[PDB]
Structures are given as structure tokens and as C-alpha cells.
Design a protein around this ligand. Sequence first.
Ligand SMILES: [Zn+2]
Lengths: 199, 209, 99, 149, 50, 76, 50, 54
Amino acid sequence: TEFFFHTMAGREGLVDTAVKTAETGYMQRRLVKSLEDLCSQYDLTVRSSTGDIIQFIYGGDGLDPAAMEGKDEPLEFKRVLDNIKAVFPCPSEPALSKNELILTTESIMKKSEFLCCQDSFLQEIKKFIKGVSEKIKKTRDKYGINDNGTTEPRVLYQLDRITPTQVEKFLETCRDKYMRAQMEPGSAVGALCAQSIGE
Amino acid sequence: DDEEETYRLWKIRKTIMQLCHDRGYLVTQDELDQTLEEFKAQSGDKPSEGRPRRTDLTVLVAHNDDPTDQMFVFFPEEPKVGIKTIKVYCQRMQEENITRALIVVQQGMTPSAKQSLVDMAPKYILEQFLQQELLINITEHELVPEHVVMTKEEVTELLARYKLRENQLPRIQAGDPVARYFGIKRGQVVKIIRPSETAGRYITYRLVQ
Amino acid sequence: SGSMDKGTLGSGSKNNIFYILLRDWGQNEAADAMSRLARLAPVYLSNRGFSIGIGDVTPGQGLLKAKYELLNAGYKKCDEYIEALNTGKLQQQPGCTAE
Amino acid sequence: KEDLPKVVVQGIPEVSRAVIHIDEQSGKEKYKLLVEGDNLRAVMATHGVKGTRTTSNNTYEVEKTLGIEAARTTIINEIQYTMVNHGMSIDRRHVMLLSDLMTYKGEVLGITRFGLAKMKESVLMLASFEKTADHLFDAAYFGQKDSVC
Amino acid sequence: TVAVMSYSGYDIEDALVLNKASLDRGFGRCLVYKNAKCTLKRYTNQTFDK
Amino acid sequence: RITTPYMTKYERARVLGTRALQIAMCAPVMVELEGETDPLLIAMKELKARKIPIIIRRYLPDGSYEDWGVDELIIT
Amino acid sequence: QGRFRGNLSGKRVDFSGRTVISPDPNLRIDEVAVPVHVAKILTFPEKVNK
Amino acid sequence: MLLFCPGCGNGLIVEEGQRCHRFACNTCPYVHNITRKVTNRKYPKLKEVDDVLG
Ligand SMILES: [Zn+2]
């Protein structure tokens, strides 16, 4: 009896797969035949074959889903900052205070190369920098670390250690990742959407 | 009755105030912010209230554009509005020299009356609104994004920025509930501010056609 | 620290070490790492030995006792529910019938 | 005697059945209505219902009631929710592009042959997809010159 | 004589490793017989395929 | 000058294809190949040396265009 | 099987082969092993240059 | 309810005579005048569920 019930369940699964294959095949054909015309133009506007505009900017932001590192966010700032700290640990430079970190971030962001970057990404970078500066301030307040750089136990400077070289590397890496995460013009956006929905 | 009906009338009046304020017509903040108690003070019962005349509005003038330009709001008492009522309203608008009017029907408009309202006159603009639609403000709904009608200069700037033509913009039907809410004509452009998942906003544009 | 598994070495999602290599140092480093893994792991696995036997799936005495007790308790509770529904009133869960 | 019990005395005639769903949030247990009906405007207009925050599954009803942008948002949310229910994730940009394509002409157009005919213009693609003979004969009758864009 | 183990990573997905000596000693040796048929028919005219 | 300064993957693919097709058809080589009998490898070497004599003509949808040198663009 | 779906959108091609696959971990992820018999059949037209 | 003619067995309808409401048969002169109250209750099913859930 148990064997018969198990076989019933197995045959249910098999017939489910059998019907699903054909149904999704037809849906895939319809979706691709409808969506294949669209293309991401060089003015960042998705246009149909006839020239009509479907979107003024793809995805509202213009970022590639294939290079989408986070959970529908271009970067995971914590991971990037940790990787920058580990790759370039500068042992000959002092750590930065909250005010120093904010000042150097504001100085770097106002350069020309960051102007072409989208304002939302700059706001997110500012928010993350403010959060990490608050973390640094909380740690130094907890352990009584002085921003003068003369606290006797130097190991206390290893708690939340950030240096201007690391800040510059992190900002340049984030800007480069954002620039390289944009839709390359001419990409077959519609076919990608059709396949990524049908599969 | 006499409690839900007066509540519906008050909320219809408040939605009309919000719609007129959004269209640019002159309404005082007291009209925009009217509690139910003040409406009861104006009229506290269904037989006391007169739908055809006690609620009609003619103080609606587009103060931003021209105070001389006038807008009118009608509340026909019959659930279905016939040809004769439309004729009476049109001749009254002729008497007071008013070209823009809204008609808040109670249940519906007869197809002959609808067709007549379509071809009353290009000069006499009248818009049919069901009370059921006006019981809730469309703009206040969370799904509906922010719509702003753009001027001709802004439309020209938008077309010049993308090297575009008018017909290439995404379309929006004239009979759309938002379009009828703002009373936009064919050829006008509406900027839509979609709220993004992040703190940013996505700006798009639609052409009425 | 830690041990490699599907969550970090599999094709599931991000946090994959190969994905990190691809996103940080380009495609060539990721491909070379994949080739090195595919050449190294089989050698160690074959030299170590990894087998599955019938005794790898046989049950212990504690499992047998626990299964017997659980089956008895569950069957008793099911019989109690059957008797409650058949003869008398069974507490009806919201949104559904007694059956 | 056949239909006197079958006359409606109260409620929306299109609405079949509404249930009191409860959210059991630790902060507070809040009550919502799940309506298995097909009249969004009537439900929104009813007293005591916060019509500002009422959604629906039928994209056509949402479109006809609250505009094409509300229809687009409903399409996006419904597709994403359906995909999430099976545990598989799709980047929101794909579904957003699909919704924008479905609602770029001011009307929610399906991916069927009718909506595809209303969207696309090239004769050859319409013929290749479905109804080859009818599309080809209509194009010949209209003398429609088709580009190769 | 099957031994269940992972070997050389050449049996990743449902693949299996065979022993060269076993195949050399006749394990799995198989024969395939195919048919080739022809017809020599006499036609309506008194002439025939030859 | 308004488009992306990065050279897209489609641009790389087409530039490499055209350069390899030209090289296979007895076009002059600018990087002094070292025993490379494959035209595509020679084209990739030219791209790495930034010596490809090809100018991309990026077309805007309205009809406007702009020219970018391969050496002028940024490669990854 | 019409012209549009069977002969226009998707059509058969030459210079192609179809074979059963087997694993091989000693190859890089960007490489595929081709049998000698197939490679002798699938030809590439190389233009003579300097 | 459903009533049938004792004469031929066809269905009886309700009509009005010159004095009273009567059951009558459509195919024969049989009639039956109504003397007292006649009723046919049905007791339709009531909505019993309170519909609290979650
Ligand atoms: Zn009878």
C-alpha cells in the first residue's frame, strides 16, 4: 500500500513536468516574439524598433542586472570597504577620526570625475560614510581613544582603523564599479528580459 | 441614510476641493480643509441639503491663470441625467458665460446624454464624473504616482534634451482616470514621478493621445 | 576560518568565492581558480577515499525506539481526533469545515 | 419563488465573498479585507475602507480604475510576488521593462496576438508569429510598405 | 565488481569509470547485426534485373 | 562626447571581428606579431597595443552621430 | 513546419555536429574536447596571408 | 408545494373563481376552493459562519 501511494506521488510529479514543459515553451515563444525588438540606445533610452520610447532610462537607473552585485543594489558597501581595508592595509598612516573622515570624503567626492555619476549613488555613498564615521565615533567614545593620535595603547587604534589612502581607494573602486555596471548601449534588453522571465 | 449620505456628500465636496486646487483654481485653505462638523453646520440632513443647488460651485476661478476664467461644479439630483438637464446646465452656463463645468452624476449618464455632452461645443467644456469615483481621491492613492502637467516651455525643453518628437513619447489615454481628474487635453504632457525603492525618484513623461 | 561548501563554492548565489574573484580581479582569475579547483579536489578525494555503504544508512537503536514511541503517540492522537469528529463535536479550525 | 431568495439586499453585486484576514504583528493585530470580487471602485467607495491603500490582482480593473501608472505598478508587484512565491528571484529591472512595454501606449496590452498586433507594426513579424495568411492578405489589401527595422 | 567511490573526478554527474583490463578481457563486449536486403524483380516487359 | 567613455563589449566584438577579417585578407599589421598564425589573436594583440586603425561611429537615435577612436576609448 | 517557423526563423545548418558528452575535469572551463573524427570533417576556411 | 389533480393527475395551478382563490387543473373541469390558510415554508440555509481567521 505504501509503495502504491509512493508510486502515485511519483507519477504525479512526472505528469506535472510533462505538462509544464509544453506550457512554458509556448509562453517563452510568445514572450520572445514580443520583446525581441527593444534595444538600449546610446542616449540611455530604451526604444522600440519604430523609434518610440519605452523607457527614458532602463530600470529607472541604468544598471546591468548581470553585474548587479547586491540584492538589486549595485554594490555591498560593507564588503567593498572590508576588501579595500584587507587589500591595502597602510601600517604607516594614522587612523581617521569622524570629522577627518567626513572632511576627506567631502573633499574627494567634489572632484570632476564624480560629477557624471548619478546623484542617488553619491547620496548612498554619503550615507554609508556617515554610518561608518558614526561607528568610529562610538568605538572611540567607548574606549576613550583620542583623535590626537597619542593614546598609549596603540592596539586601540586597530579597533576601527581607516586611513585616507583606504578612503581614496574605496571611493575610486565604488565609482569604477558603478561606471562599469551600467548598460552597455546596443544590448538586447528585450530578449534578456524575455529569457530571464520565461526560464 | 442621513448619516452615510451626508458623509458621502462631504467627502465628495472635499475631493472636489482637492481636484480644483490641483487643477490650479482658487480655493481657500478652509475649503480644502473642511471637517464633517462644518459641513453639518452648512447642512445636517439629506432633505435639508439641496443637491442641485445648495452644493453647486461657481466661485472656481483659475487664479493662477486668469480670475476672469471661471469653472463650475454641478450636482444633478436625478441618478441618471437626461438630455433636458444637460440643456438646462448648458443654457445656465451660457447665461453666466462659463465655459468649464463638471457634472457629478449620482448613478450614471444616459448614452444619448453622454453623446450630447461629447458634442455640446468645443467652447463649452463639460466633464462627467461619477460620485463613486469622487468618493476617493485618486492622487492620494499609494499606487498612483505624482503627476504634474508641464507647460509648453517645459515640453519644448524636454523635446530638445532628447532630440525627440511629440509622437515618440509614451502615450496616456484622455479617458484615463488621472487624465480626467486633471482635465488634460490631447497634446499636453504629464511628468510622472515614480517613487523608487531607494530614496531616489524616477522621472518619466507621457503624452495625452 | 570556516569550511568550503555549496553556499560559498556552489552555483547558488553571491558570496561565492569565484564570484568575488570575478567581481574583483576579472574573468581570467576566476577561470584559473575554477580550473585549479577542478584539478585539485578530485585528486585529494580519490587519494582519501569517499564511499557510501548500506551501513551508512542503517538505523541505530535509539532511532528505532524514538520512532516507535513517536508512531504510537501520533497514532493515538490521530485516533483521538477521529473519535472526536465522528462522535461528538470537534473543535473546528477557522475558515474550514470539520472534515 | 425561484428568484425572490436570489435578490441582493446589501453589498456589491459583483463581490462574491469577503473574508476578515488578520495580521498578527507583535506590535498589533490589524484587520484587513480579502475580497474575491471584481469591482475595485465599489470596494474603494464603501464606507470604512481606506481606499487610498487598497490594491487588486486584476490588472485590467486596476488600470480602468486608477490609471495606467497604477496598472504598471500592479503588474510589477504581482509578477514579483508570483515569482517570489516559488522562491526564485528575478531582478526588478526585467519586470519593470516588461510592465513599461505592456503600458507604453496608454493601455494595458497583453502579449497575445491581439496585443502584439496593436503594439508592433512590421507586417512580416506579425505574419510569422500567428495568423500568417490573414495578416499577409490584410497587408496586401492595405498596401502597407514594411521597413526592415 | 562495482566499488562505490569517487575516483579521478571523471564520474561527476552519473558518469562511471570502467576498467581497461575488464574491457580487454571481454566485459561489455557486444555484437551489432545489421541487414542489407536487395530485390531483383521481373518487370511487366519480359526483362529482369540482373 | 556625451556617450560612455568605456568601450562596450559589442564594440570590442565588432572591432576585433573587422580587424581579424582585414588581417586575414592581407592587411598590414601594426604590432609585429611573434609567431601568431591566428588572425584573431593578432587582432587582440593590436587592441591591447591600442594600434587598431578603426574609428567607431556611435549613432544617436535621432540621427546625430559622434566618432570615437579605439585608442580614445577605455578598454577593460 | 511552415516557411516562417521551419525555414525562416529557425533553419538547419551545415558545418555542425551532434555527439554524446562525457565529463573531463582536466580541461579549462573555456575549452571543449572535440573528437578527432569530427574535427577531420568540420572544416574552417582560412585565408592565406603573410 | 406541488399538487396534482385527483381526476387526471396533471399539475394544479392557483387561479381566482367568482368567490374565492381555487386550485384548478388545466385539462379538466376539476377545481378546489381554498377554505383555510395553506402554507409552504422552505427554511433556506442561514449564514452561520462568523468568519474570523488568522
Ligand atoms: Zn385534472
